[PDB]
Amino acid sequence: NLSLLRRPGEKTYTQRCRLFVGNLPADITEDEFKRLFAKYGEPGEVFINKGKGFGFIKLESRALAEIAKAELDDTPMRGRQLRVRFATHAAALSVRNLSPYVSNELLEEAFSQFGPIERAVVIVDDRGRSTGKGIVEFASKPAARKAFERCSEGVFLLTTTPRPVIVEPLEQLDDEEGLPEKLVIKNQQFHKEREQPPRFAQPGSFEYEYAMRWKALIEMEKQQREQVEKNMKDAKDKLESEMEDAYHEHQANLL
Amino acid sequence: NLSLLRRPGEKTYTQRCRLFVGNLPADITEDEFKRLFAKYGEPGEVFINKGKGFGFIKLESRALAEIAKAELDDTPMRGRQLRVRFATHAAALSVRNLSPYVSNELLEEAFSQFGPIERAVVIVDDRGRSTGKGIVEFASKPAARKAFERCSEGVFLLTTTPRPVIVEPLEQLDDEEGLPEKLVIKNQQFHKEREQPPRFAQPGSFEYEYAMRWKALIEMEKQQREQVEKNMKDAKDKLESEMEDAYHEHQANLL
């Protein structure tokens, strides 16, 4: 049954299997909360805050969590509509400034000293090349905190070149659920913005002139942003050239 | 069986179900290529280039494609190891400069005029707020090309405010397969960089001084980048203020 829903290789009960549940009834008990999810296999770690009406539950696999979220979100429980969402990932880190010779496996080996790793991936572009950025997800939050603190306050190197890894807690974007219409607040500004439907503006119209100015601002930002990035690249290249010179004399025992 | 592997809601045979297969034998036929994937349900669209030894196949669901990729990549077929990867997404678009009142459903409705939509999502941050960016994936490449061309050369508005959508072909990053170690070229530079293992540099050492300079360059880029973004925000705010003034007189039939 439910073990067919695991992805190839997938480990069980990971941080990505954790659901948030809100708007629970006042008399909710832990066993009643578990029973809500009994259909979706054996429960993992469970927490409830009865007074504030919310809890967390880890399910076996990502697919089971998605099924549970889809079937239970916005359904009634004793007079209130439950709110079932994927929980935030507070044991995940973004890592940047990776040498292109850092792999998934090396990234995992390096950060495994701080604690058990659930996920360690080097992000690659649509040409298969390292972007210099990656993600490390720890099984526990203290381990992710230790890794962020040690790498921020000191110099953590993954390769011979002294290229320090830059670590920040992951600020994950959501491109699967997105912004559903029923989750958009239908305030006064909402109804104002929806008065006119999607449309093309004609040259010379009211809208067209302002919109072309808006395009121009965005193009100016793109140009200025690339200037910043190119200056960074040139500064990196100058530093790398200087380090290489010194490294060759260092290896000759002259430094 | 294989219909349990569909995600909740998921449509079948989408662009995200398309696999690339390389290093096929010289005598490959289309029916032999289909037979390689016979275990994974009914095949969708299939293409082969016999002379260059590669083909594409769409499978029913994303989960089936991942199973097929995991089981067939780097396996022998008549003397050569097959290369099975997820195909590139050339009918997908990135859309930016979205008003925060654009939902998944409005984005889909707007771009559905160019052709059938497989996916339309507004990307939200870890606070559930619109990032101003989204993804639109068309069932066909001509439709995605039409949408990119019309929105680039003209002014496409989704709301009353004349905020133009900025459309570019999607440059998708990969955070699932990542950069596996066996896909890293083990050239001379590779072995040089792996000589020293992951480690912390001590203050006053060779490595530490250069690495702190590297951190400083990255901090300077962060600061300069935020300056560019804040200048963009202020310019947007000034334009929005001017448009609002004019819109109120426009609605009074004075403009």
Side-chain angles (χ1 to χ4, degrees), chain A residues 16 66 101 103-105 119 122 124 154-155 157 159-161 174-179 181 193-194 199 201 213 215 242, chain B residues 16 66 101 103-105 119 122 124 154-155 157 159-161 174-179 181 193-194 199 201 213 215 242:
Chain A
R16 298 207 287 193
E66 301 178 20
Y101 295 99
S103 60
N104 304 330
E105 290 84 346
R119 172 194 191 194
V122 174
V124 299
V155 168
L157 312 173
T159 59
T160 301
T161 294
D174 181 11
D175 58 3
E176 282 303 317
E177 193 204 36
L179 186 51
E181 172 84 349
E193 289 295 352
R194 298 295 186 86
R199 72 205 174 279
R213 291 170 57 184
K215 285 199 182 187
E242 183 190 333
Chain B
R16 298 207 287 193
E66 301 178 20
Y101 295 99
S103 60
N104 304 330
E105 290 84 346
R119 172 194 191 194
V122 174
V124 299
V155 168
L157 312 173
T159 59
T160 301
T161 294
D174 181 11
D175 58 3
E176 282 303 317
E177 193 204 36
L179 186 51
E181 172 84 349
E193 289 295 352
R194 298 295 186 86
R199 72 205 174 279
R213 291 170 57 184
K215 285 199 182 187
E242 183 190 333

Short mmCIF file of all heavy atoms in Angstrom, two decimals, chain A residues 7 16 66 101 103-105 119 122 124 154-155 157 159-161 174-179 181 192-194 199 201 213 215 242, chain B residues 7 16 66 101 103-105 119 122 124 154-155 157 159-161 174-179 181 192-194 199 201 213 215 242, unseen atoms left out:
data_model
loop_
_atom_site.label_atom_id
_atom_site.label_comp_id
_atom_site.label_asym_id
_atom_site.label_seq_id
_atom_site.Cartn_x
_atom_site.Cartn_y
_atom_site.Cartn_z
N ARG A 7 9.22 8.08 -2.94
CA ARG A 7 10.09 8.35 -4.08
C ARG A 7 11.27 7.38 -4.07
O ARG A 7 11.64 6.84 -3.02
CB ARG A 7 10.61 9.78 -4.02
CG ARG A 7 10.01 10.72 -5.04
CD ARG A 7 10.71 12.07 -5.01
N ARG A 16 10.47 17.29 5.32
CA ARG A 16 9.55 17.58 4.23
C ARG A 16 8.26 16.78 4.33
O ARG A 16 7.36 16.97 3.49
CB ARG A 16 10.24 17.34 2.89
CG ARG A 16 11.44 18.24 2.69
CD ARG A 16 11.74 18.50 1.22
NE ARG A 16 12.31 17.34 0.56
CZ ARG A 16 12.89 17.38 -0.64
NH1 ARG A 16 12.97 18.51 -1.32
NH2 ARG A 16 13.40 16.27 -1.15
N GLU A 66 1.26 14.87 1.07
CA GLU A 66 0.50 15.64 0.08
C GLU A 66 -0.93 15.13 -0.02
O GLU A 66 -1.86 15.92 -0.18
CB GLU A 66 1.19 15.58 -1.28
CG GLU A 66 2.61 16.11 -1.28
CD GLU A 66 3.25 15.98 -2.63
OE1 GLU A 66 2.49 15.83 -3.62
OE2 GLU A 66 4.49 16.01 -2.73
N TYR A 101 33.59 22.21 -7.88
CA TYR A 101 34.00 20.83 -7.66
C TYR A 101 33.40 20.24 -6.39
O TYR A 101 33.81 19.15 -5.97
CB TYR A 101 35.53 20.75 -7.63
CG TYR A 101 36.13 21.10 -8.96
CD1 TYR A 101 36.64 22.37 -9.21
CD2 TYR A 101 36.16 20.17 -10.00
CE1 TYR A 101 37.17 22.70 -10.44
CE2 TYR A 101 36.69 20.49 -11.23
CZ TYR A 101 37.20 21.75 -11.45
OH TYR A 101 37.73 22.07 -12.68
N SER A 103 30.31 18.37 -4.85
CA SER A 103 29.18 17.56 -5.24
C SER A 103 28.18 17.46 -4.10
O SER A 103 28.43 17.91 -2.98
CB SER A 103 29.64 16.16 -5.65
OG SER A 103 30.30 15.52 -4.57
N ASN A 104 27.02 16.85 -4.40
CA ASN A 104 26.06 16.50 -3.35
C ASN A 104 26.75 15.73 -2.24
O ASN A 104 26.58 16.03 -1.05
CB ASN A 104 24.93 15.65 -3.92
CG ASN A 104 24.21 16.31 -5.07
OD1 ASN A 104 24.11 17.53 -5.15
ND2 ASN A 104 23.68 15.50 -5.98
N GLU A 105 27.55 14.73 -2.62
CA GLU A 105 28.14 13.82 -1.64
C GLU A 105 29.19 14.53 -0.79
O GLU A 105 29.25 14.31 0.43
CB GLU A 105 28.73 12.61 -2.37
CG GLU A 105 27.69 11.66 -2.97
CD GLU A 105 27.19 12.08 -4.34
OE1 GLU A 105 27.44 13.24 -4.75
OE2 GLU A 105 26.56 11.25 -5.03
N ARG A 119 19.13 15.76 3.85
CA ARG A 119 19.23 16.17 2.46
C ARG A 119 20.41 17.10 2.29
O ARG A 119 20.60 18.03 3.09
CB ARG A 119 17.94 16.85 2.00
CG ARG A 119 17.98 17.49 0.62
CD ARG A 119 16.77 18.41 0.46
NE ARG A 119 16.58 18.87 -0.91
CZ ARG A 119 15.78 19.87 -1.26
NH1 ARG A 119 15.11 20.56 -0.35
NH2 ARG A 119 15.64 20.18 -2.54
N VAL A 122 23.57 20.05 -4.25
CA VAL A 122 24.13 21.20 -4.96
C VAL A 122 23.15 21.57 -6.06
O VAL A 122 22.79 20.73 -6.88
CB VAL A 122 25.51 20.87 -5.54
CG1 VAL A 122 26.01 22.02 -6.39
CG2 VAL A 122 26.51 20.54 -4.43
N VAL A 124 21.95 22.91 -9.46
CA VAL A 124 22.54 23.04 -10.78
C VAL A 124 21.54 23.74 -11.70
O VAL A 124 20.33 23.67 -11.50
CB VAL A 124 22.97 21.69 -11.39
CG1 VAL A 124 24.02 21.03 -10.50
CG2 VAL A 124 21.78 20.77 -11.58
N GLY A 154 33.26 31.46 11.85
CA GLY A 154 34.56 31.01 11.42
C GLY A 154 34.65 30.85 9.92
O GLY A 154 33.81 31.35 9.17
N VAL A 155 35.68 30.15 9.46
CA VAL A 155 35.93 29.96 8.04
C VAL A 155 35.85 28.47 7.76
O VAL A 155 36.72 27.70 8.18
CB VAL A 155 37.29 30.53 7.62
CG1 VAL A 155 37.63 30.06 6.23
CG2 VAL A 155 37.27 32.04 7.71
N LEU A 157 35.88 25.59 4.95
CA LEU A 157 36.36 25.31 3.60
C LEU A 157 36.01 23.88 3.22
O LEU A 157 36.09 22.98 4.05
CB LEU A 157 37.88 25.52 3.52
CG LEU A 157 38.40 26.82 4.12
CD1 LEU A 157 39.93 26.84 4.14
CD2 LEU A 157 37.84 28.02 3.35
N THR A 159 37.29 22.62 0.06
CA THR A 159 38.25 22.24 -0.96
C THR A 159 39.60 22.84 -0.60
O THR A 159 39.74 23.56 0.40
CB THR A 159 37.80 22.73 -2.35
OG1 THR A 159 37.67 24.16 -2.32
CG2 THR A 159 36.46 22.11 -2.75
N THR A 160 40.61 22.55 -1.43
CA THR A 160 41.94 23.09 -1.20
C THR A 160 41.94 24.61 -1.28
O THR A 160 42.47 25.29 -0.39
CB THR A 160 42.91 22.50 -2.22
OG1 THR A 160 42.92 21.07 -2.09
CG2 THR A 160 44.31 23.05 -2.00
N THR A 161 41.35 25.16 -2.33
CA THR A 161 41.20 26.61 -2.44
C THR A 161 40.44 27.14 -1.23
O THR A 161 39.39 26.59 -0.88
CB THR A 161 40.46 26.97 -3.72
OG1 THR A 161 41.26 26.61 -4.85
CG2 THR A 161 40.16 28.47 -3.78
N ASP A 174 7.85 28.71 -2.53
CA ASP A 174 6.84 27.69 -2.79
C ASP A 174 6.33 27.87 -4.21
O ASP A 174 5.65 28.86 -4.51
CB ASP A 174 5.70 27.78 -1.77
CG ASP A 174 4.64 26.72 -1.98
OD1 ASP A 174 4.86 25.78 -2.77
OD2 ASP A 174 3.57 26.82 -1.34
N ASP A 175 6.65 26.92 -5.09
CA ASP A 175 6.15 26.92 -6.46
C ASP A 175 5.24 25.73 -6.73
O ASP A 175 5.00 25.39 -7.90
CB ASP A 175 7.31 26.97 -7.46
CG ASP A 175 8.28 25.80 -7.31
OD1 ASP A 175 8.04 24.92 -6.47
OD2 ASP A 175 9.29 25.78 -8.04
N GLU A 176 4.72 25.08 -5.70
CA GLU A 176 3.78 23.98 -5.89
C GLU A 176 2.36 24.37 -5.50
O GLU A 176 1.44 24.26 -6.32
CB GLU A 176 4.24 22.73 -5.12
CG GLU A 176 5.35 21.97 -5.83
CD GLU A 176 4.97 21.54 -7.24
OE1 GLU A 176 3.83 21.07 -7.43
OE2 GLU A 176 5.81 21.67 -8.15
N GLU A 177 2.15 24.83 -4.26
CA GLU A 177 0.82 25.34 -3.92
C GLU A 177 0.63 26.75 -4.44
O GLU A 177 -0.45 27.09 -4.95
CB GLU A 177 0.59 25.31 -2.41
CG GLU A 177 -0.87 25.53 -2.04
CD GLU A 177 -1.07 26.07 -0.63
OE1 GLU A 177 -0.24 26.89 -0.19
OE2 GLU A 177 -2.06 25.69 0.02
N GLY A 178 1.66 27.58 -4.33
CA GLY A 178 1.58 28.93 -4.88
C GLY A 178 0.65 29.82 -4.07
O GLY A 178 0.61 29.76 -2.84
N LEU A 179 -0.10 30.66 -4.78
CA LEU A 179 -1.04 31.61 -4.18
C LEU A 179 -2.43 31.31 -4.72
O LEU A 179 -2.88 31.93 -5.70
CB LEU A 179 -0.64 33.05 -4.45
CG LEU A 179 -1.47 34.12 -3.74
CD1 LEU A 179 -1.57 33.81 -2.26
CD2 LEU A 179 -0.88 35.50 -3.97
N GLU A 181 -6.44 31.32 -5.23
CA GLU A 181 -7.34 32.46 -5.21
C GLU A 181 -8.10 32.57 -3.89
O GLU A 181 -8.27 33.68 -3.36
CB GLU A 181 -8.32 32.37 -6.39
CG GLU A 181 -9.44 33.41 -6.38
CD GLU A 181 -9.02 34.75 -6.97
OE1 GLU A 181 -7.81 34.94 -7.21
OE2 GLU A 181 -9.90 35.60 -7.20
N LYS A 192 -10.66 46.58 -6.37
CA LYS A 192 -10.19 47.62 -7.27
C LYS A 192 -9.32 47.02 -8.37
O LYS A 192 -9.52 47.30 -9.56
CB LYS A 192 -9.42 48.68 -6.48
CG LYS A 192 -9.29 50.03 -7.17
CD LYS A 192 -8.08 50.11 -8.09
N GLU A 193 -8.36 46.17 -7.99
CA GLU A 193 -7.42 45.65 -8.97
C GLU A 193 -8.07 44.69 -9.96
O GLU A 193 -7.57 44.53 -11.08
CB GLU A 193 -6.25 44.97 -8.26
CG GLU A 193 -5.30 45.92 -7.54
CD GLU A 193 -4.55 46.86 -8.47
OE1 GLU A 193 -4.63 46.68 -9.71
OE2 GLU A 193 -3.88 47.77 -7.96
N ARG A 194 -9.17 44.05 -9.57
CA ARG A 194 -9.82 43.09 -10.45
C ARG A 194 -10.90 43.71 -11.33
O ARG A 194 -11.52 43.00 -12.13
CB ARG A 194 -10.42 41.94 -9.63
CG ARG A 194 -9.40 41.13 -8.84
CD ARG A 194 -8.44 40.39 -9.76
NE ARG A 194 -7.54 39.51 -9.02
CZ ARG A 194 -7.84 38.26 -8.68
NH1 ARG A 194 -9.00 37.71 -9.00
NH2 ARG A 194 -6.95 37.54 -8.01
N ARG A 199 -5.45 42.06 -20.15
CA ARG A 199 -5.64 42.78 -21.41
C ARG A 199 -4.30 43.34 -21.88
O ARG A 199 -3.38 43.53 -21.08
CB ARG A 199 -6.65 43.91 -21.25
CG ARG A 199 -6.10 45.07 -20.43
CD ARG A 199 -7.18 45.88 -19.75
NE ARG A 199 -6.61 46.89 -18.88
CZ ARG A 199 -6.17 46.65 -17.65
NH1 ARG A 199 -6.24 45.44 -17.12
NH2 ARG A 199 -5.65 47.65 -16.94
N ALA A 201 -2.44 46.64 -23.42
CA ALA A 201 -2.61 48.08 -23.54
C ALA A 201 -2.20 48.54 -24.93
O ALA A 201 -1.23 48.04 -25.51
CB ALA A 201 -1.79 48.81 -22.48
N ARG A 213 7.07 53.05 -18.78
CA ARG A 213 7.97 53.58 -17.76
C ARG A 213 8.30 52.51 -16.73
O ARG A 213 9.45 52.42 -16.27
CB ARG A 213 7.34 54.81 -17.11
CG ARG A 213 7.25 56.01 -18.05
CD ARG A 213 6.41 57.13 -17.45
NE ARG A 213 6.92 57.58 -16.16
CZ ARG A 213 6.33 58.49 -15.41
NH1 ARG A 213 5.21 59.09 -15.80
NH2 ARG A 213 6.86 58.81 -14.23
N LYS A 215 8.35 49.18 -17.26
CA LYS A 215 9.33 48.30 -17.90
C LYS A 215 10.72 48.90 -17.86
O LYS A 215 11.71 48.20 -17.62
CB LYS A 215 8.93 48.02 -19.36
CG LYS A 215 7.79 47.03 -19.55
CD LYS A 215 7.79 46.46 -20.97
CE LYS A 215 6.63 45.50 -21.19
NZ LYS A 215 6.73 44.82 -22.51
N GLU A 242 45.78 36.22 -7.06
CA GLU A 242 46.76 36.48 -6.00
C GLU A 242 46.99 35.24 -5.15
O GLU A 242 48.13 34.93 -4.78
CB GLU A 242 46.28 37.66 -5.16
CG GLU A 242 47.22 38.09 -4.07
CD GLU A 242 46.58 39.10 -3.13
OE1 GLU A 242 45.67 39.84 -3.56
OE2 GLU A 242 46.99 39.14 -1.95
N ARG B 7 0.13 12.48 -8.29
CA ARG B 7 -0.09 13.46 -7.24
C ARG B 7 -1.56 13.87 -7.20
O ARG B 7 -2.26 13.77 -8.21
CB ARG B 7 0.78 14.69 -7.46
CG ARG B 7 1.94 14.83 -6.50
CD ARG B 7 2.64 16.17 -6.70
N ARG B 16 6.52 17.93 -17.47
CA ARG B 16 7.35 17.45 -16.37
C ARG B 16 7.43 15.93 -16.31
O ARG B 16 8.13 15.39 -15.46
CB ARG B 16 6.82 18.01 -15.04
CG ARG B 16 6.88 19.52 -14.99
CD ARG B 16 6.99 20.05 -13.57
NE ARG B 16 5.75 19.93 -12.83
CZ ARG B 16 5.52 20.54 -11.67
NH1 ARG B 16 6.43 21.32 -11.11
NH2 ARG B 16 4.34 20.38 -11.08
N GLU B 66 10.05 9.44 -12.53
CA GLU B 66 11.16 9.36 -11.59
C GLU B 66 11.57 7.91 -11.36
O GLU B 66 12.76 7.61 -11.24
CB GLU B 66 10.79 10.02 -10.27
CG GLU B 66 10.41 11.47 -10.39
CD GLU B 66 10.00 12.05 -9.06
OE1 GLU B 66 10.37 11.45 -8.03
OE2 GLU B 66 9.32 13.10 -9.04
N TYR B 101 -2.05 40.91 -5.99
CA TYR B 101 -3.42 40.44 -6.10
C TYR B 101 -3.62 39.49 -7.28
O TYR B 101 -4.77 39.16 -7.61
CB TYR B 101 -4.37 41.64 -6.21
CG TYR B 101 -4.35 42.46 -4.94
CD1 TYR B 101 -3.60 43.62 -4.85
CD2 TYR B 101 -5.08 42.06 -3.83
CE1 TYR B 101 -3.57 44.37 -3.68
CE2 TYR B 101 -5.06 42.79 -2.66
CZ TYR B 101 -4.31 43.95 -2.59
OH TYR B 101 -4.29 44.68 -1.43
N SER B 103 -3.46 35.76 -8.47
CA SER B 103 -3.45 34.40 -7.94
C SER B 103 -3.02 33.42 -9.02
O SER B 103 -2.85 33.77 -10.19
CB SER B 103 -4.84 34.03 -7.42
OG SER B 103 -5.80 34.10 -8.47
N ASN B 104 -2.84 32.16 -8.60
CA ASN B 104 -2.63 31.07 -9.56
C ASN B 104 -3.71 31.09 -10.63
O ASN B 104 -3.43 31.01 -11.83
CB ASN B 104 -2.64 29.72 -8.85
CG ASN B 104 -1.63 29.62 -7.74
OD1 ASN B 104 -0.57 30.24 -7.78
ND2 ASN B 104 -1.95 28.81 -6.73
N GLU B 105 -4.96 31.21 -10.19
CA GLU B 105 -6.09 31.08 -11.10
C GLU B 105 -6.16 32.26 -12.07
O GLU B 105 -6.44 32.07 -13.26
CB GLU B 105 -7.39 30.95 -10.30
CG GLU B 105 -7.54 29.62 -9.55
CD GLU B 105 -6.83 29.59 -8.20
OE1 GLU B 105 -6.01 30.48 -7.92
OE2 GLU B 105 -7.11 28.66 -7.41
N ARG B 119 0.38 24.28 -16.29
CA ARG B 119 0.73 24.73 -14.96
C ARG B 119 0.82 26.25 -14.94
O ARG B 119 1.44 26.85 -15.83
CB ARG B 119 2.05 24.11 -14.50
CG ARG B 119 2.62 24.64 -13.20
CD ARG B 119 4.07 24.19 -13.06
NE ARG B 119 4.63 24.43 -11.73
CZ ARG B 119 5.92 24.37 -11.45
NH1 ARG B 119 6.83 24.13 -12.38
NH2 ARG B 119 6.32 24.57 -10.19
N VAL B 122 1.75 31.14 -8.89
CA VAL B 122 2.41 32.31 -8.33
C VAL B 122 3.33 31.84 -7.22
O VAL B 122 2.89 31.15 -6.30
CB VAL B 122 1.37 33.32 -7.78
CG1 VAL B 122 2.07 34.47 -7.07
CG2 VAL B 122 0.47 33.84 -8.90
N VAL B 124 5.28 31.94 -3.90
CA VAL B 124 5.12 32.63 -2.63
C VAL B 124 6.31 32.30 -1.74
O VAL B 124 6.94 31.25 -1.87
CB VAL B 124 3.80 32.28 -1.92
CG1 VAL B 124 2.61 32.67 -2.79
CG2 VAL B 124 3.74 30.80 -1.58
N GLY B 154 4.70 43.97 -26.50
CA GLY B 154 3.61 44.82 -26.09
C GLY B 154 3.50 44.95 -24.59
O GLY B 154 4.43 44.61 -23.85
N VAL B 155 2.36 45.43 -24.11
CA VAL B 155 2.14 45.67 -22.70
C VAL B 155 0.98 44.79 -22.26
O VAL B 155 -0.17 45.02 -22.66
CB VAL B 155 1.85 47.14 -22.40
CG1 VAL B 155 1.34 47.30 -20.99
CG2 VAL B 155 3.09 47.98 -22.64
N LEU B 157 -1.25 43.45 -19.20
CA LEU B 157 -1.68 43.82 -17.86
C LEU B 157 -2.63 42.76 -17.32
O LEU B 157 -3.46 42.23 -18.06
CB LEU B 157 -2.38 45.18 -17.87
CG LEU B 157 -1.64 46.29 -18.62
CD1 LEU B 157 -2.51 47.54 -18.72
CD2 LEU B 157 -0.31 46.58 -17.94
N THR B 159 -4.24 43.40 -14.12
CA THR B 159 -5.04 44.06 -13.11
C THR B 159 -5.35 45.47 -13.60
O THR B 159 -4.89 45.90 -14.67
CB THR B 159 -4.32 44.11 -11.76
OG1 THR B 159 -3.08 44.81 -11.92
CG2 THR B 159 -4.04 42.70 -11.23
N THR B 160 -6.12 46.21 -12.80
CA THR B 160 -6.46 47.58 -13.15
C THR B 160 -5.21 48.45 -13.22
O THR B 160 -5.00 49.19 -14.19
CB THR B 160 -7.44 48.14 -12.13
OG1 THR B 160 -8.62 47.33 -12.11
CG2 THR B 160 -7.81 49.58 -12.47
N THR B 161 -4.36 48.39 -12.20
CA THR B 161 -3.09 49.10 -12.22
C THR B 161 -2.28 48.66 -13.44
O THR B 161 -2.15 47.45 -13.68
CB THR B 161 -2.30 48.82 -10.94
OG1 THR B 161 -3.01 49.38 -9.82
CG2 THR B 161 -0.91 49.43 -11.02
N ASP B 174 17.77 23.04 -10.65
CA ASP B 174 17.52 21.66 -10.23
C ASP B 174 18.04 21.48 -8.81
O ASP B 174 19.25 21.51 -8.58
CB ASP B 174 18.20 20.68 -11.19
CG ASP B 174 17.95 19.23 -10.83
OD1 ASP B 174 17.09 18.96 -9.96
OD2 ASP B 174 18.62 18.35 -11.42
N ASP B 175 17.12 21.29 -7.86
CA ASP B 175 17.48 21.01 -6.47
C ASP B 175 17.04 19.62 -6.04
O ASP B 175 16.96 19.34 -4.84
CB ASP B 175 16.90 22.08 -5.54
CG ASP B 175 15.38 22.20 -5.63
OD1 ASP B 175 14.76 21.42 -6.37
OD2 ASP B 175 14.82 23.09 -4.95
N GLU B 176 16.75 18.72 -6.98
CA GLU B 176 16.40 17.35 -6.64
C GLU B 176 17.52 16.38 -6.99
O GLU B 176 17.99 15.64 -6.12
CB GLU B 176 15.08 16.94 -7.30
CG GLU B 176 13.86 17.49 -6.58
CD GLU B 176 13.79 17.07 -5.12
OE1 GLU B 176 14.07 15.89 -4.82
OE2 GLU B 176 13.46 17.92 -4.26
N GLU B 177 17.95 16.34 -8.25
CA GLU B 177 19.11 15.51 -8.57
C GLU B 177 20.40 16.21 -8.18
O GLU B 177 21.32 15.57 -7.66
CB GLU B 177 19.14 15.16 -10.06
CG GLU B 177 20.14 14.05 -10.38
CD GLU B 177 20.63 14.06 -11.82
OE1 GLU B 177 20.80 15.17 -12.38
OE2 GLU B 177 20.85 12.97 -12.38
N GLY B 178 20.49 17.51 -8.43
CA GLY B 178 21.66 18.26 -8.01
C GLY B 178 22.88 17.93 -8.85
O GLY B 178 22.79 17.74 -10.07
N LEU B 179 24.03 17.87 -8.19
CA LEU B 179 25.31 17.57 -8.83
C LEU B 179 25.89 16.32 -8.20
O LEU B 179 26.71 16.40 -7.26
CB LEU B 179 26.28 18.75 -8.72
CG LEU B 179 27.59 18.60 -9.49
CD1 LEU B 179 27.33 18.21 -10.93
CD2 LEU B 179 28.39 19.90 -9.43
N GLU B 181 28.23 13.10 -7.48
CA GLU B 181 29.68 13.01 -7.57
C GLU B 181 30.14 12.33 -8.85
O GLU B 181 31.11 12.76 -9.48
CB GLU B 181 30.23 12.27 -6.34
CG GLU B 181 31.72 11.95 -6.40
CD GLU B 181 32.60 13.10 -5.96
OE1 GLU B 181 32.08 14.23 -5.80
OE2 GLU B 181 33.82 12.89 -5.77
N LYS B 192 43.19 18.42 -7.63
CA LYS B 192 43.81 19.48 -6.85
C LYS B 192 42.88 19.96 -5.75
O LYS B 192 43.28 20.08 -4.58
CB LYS B 192 44.20 20.64 -7.78
CG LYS B 192 45.27 21.58 -7.23
CD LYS B 192 44.68 22.70 -6.39
N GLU B 193 41.62 20.23 -6.09
CA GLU B 193 40.70 20.80 -5.11
C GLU B 193 40.34 19.82 -4.01
O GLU B 193 39.98 20.25 -2.91
CB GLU B 193 39.43 21.30 -5.81
CG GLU B 193 39.63 22.54 -6.67
CD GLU B 193 40.02 23.78 -5.87
OE1 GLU B 193 39.98 23.73 -4.63
OE2 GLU B 193 40.35 24.80 -6.50
N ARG B 194 40.42 18.52 -4.27
CA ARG B 194 40.06 17.52 -3.27
C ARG B 194 41.23 17.08 -2.41
O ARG B 194 41.04 16.25 -1.51
CB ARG B 194 39.42 16.30 -3.95
CG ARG B 194 38.13 16.60 -4.71
CD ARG B 194 37.03 17.06 -3.77
NE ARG B 194 35.75 17.21 -4.46
CZ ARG B 194 34.88 16.23 -4.66
NH1 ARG B 194 35.12 15.00 -4.23
NH2 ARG B 194 33.75 16.49 -5.31
N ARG B 199 37.21 21.46 6.25
CA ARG B 199 37.96 21.84 7.44
C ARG B 199 37.67 23.29 7.78
O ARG B 199 37.26 24.08 6.93
CB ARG B 199 39.46 21.64 7.22
CG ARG B 199 40.05 22.67 6.27
CD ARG B 199 41.30 22.17 5.57
NE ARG B 199 41.76 23.13 4.57
CZ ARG B 199 41.25 23.23 3.35
NH1 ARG B 199 40.27 22.44 2.94
NH2 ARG B 199 41.72 24.16 2.52
N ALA B 201 39.39 26.83 8.90
CA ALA B 201 40.67 27.53 8.88
C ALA B 201 40.88 28.27 10.20
O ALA B 201 39.94 28.82 10.78
CB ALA B 201 40.74 28.51 7.72
N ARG B 213 38.93 37.80 3.18
CA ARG B 213 38.80 38.74 2.07
C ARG B 213 37.68 38.30 1.13
O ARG B 213 36.93 39.14 0.62
CB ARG B 213 40.13 38.86 1.33
CG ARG B 213 41.21 39.56 2.15
CD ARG B 213 42.58 39.45 1.49
NE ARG B 213 42.59 39.99 0.14
CZ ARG B 213 43.64 39.95 -0.67
NH1 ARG B 213 44.78 39.42 -0.28
NH2 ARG B 213 43.54 40.45 -1.90
N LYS B 215 34.96 36.50 1.98
CA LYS B 215 33.71 36.86 2.66
C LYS B 215 33.40 38.34 2.48
O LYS B 215 32.25 38.72 2.26
CB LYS B 215 33.78 36.52 4.15
CG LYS B 215 33.64 35.04 4.49
CD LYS B 215 33.24 34.86 5.96
CE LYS B 215 33.14 33.39 6.33
NZ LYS B 215 32.59 33.22 7.70
N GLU B 242 2.37 58.75 -8.80
CA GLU B 242 1.97 59.59 -9.92
C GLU B 242 0.78 58.99 -10.67
O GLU B 242 -0.15 59.72 -11.05
CB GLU B 242 3.17 59.79 -10.85
CG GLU B 242 2.92 60.69 -12.03
CD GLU B 242 4.07 60.65 -13.03
OE1 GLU B 242 5.22 60.38 -12.62
OE2 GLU B 242 3.80 60.89 -14.22
#
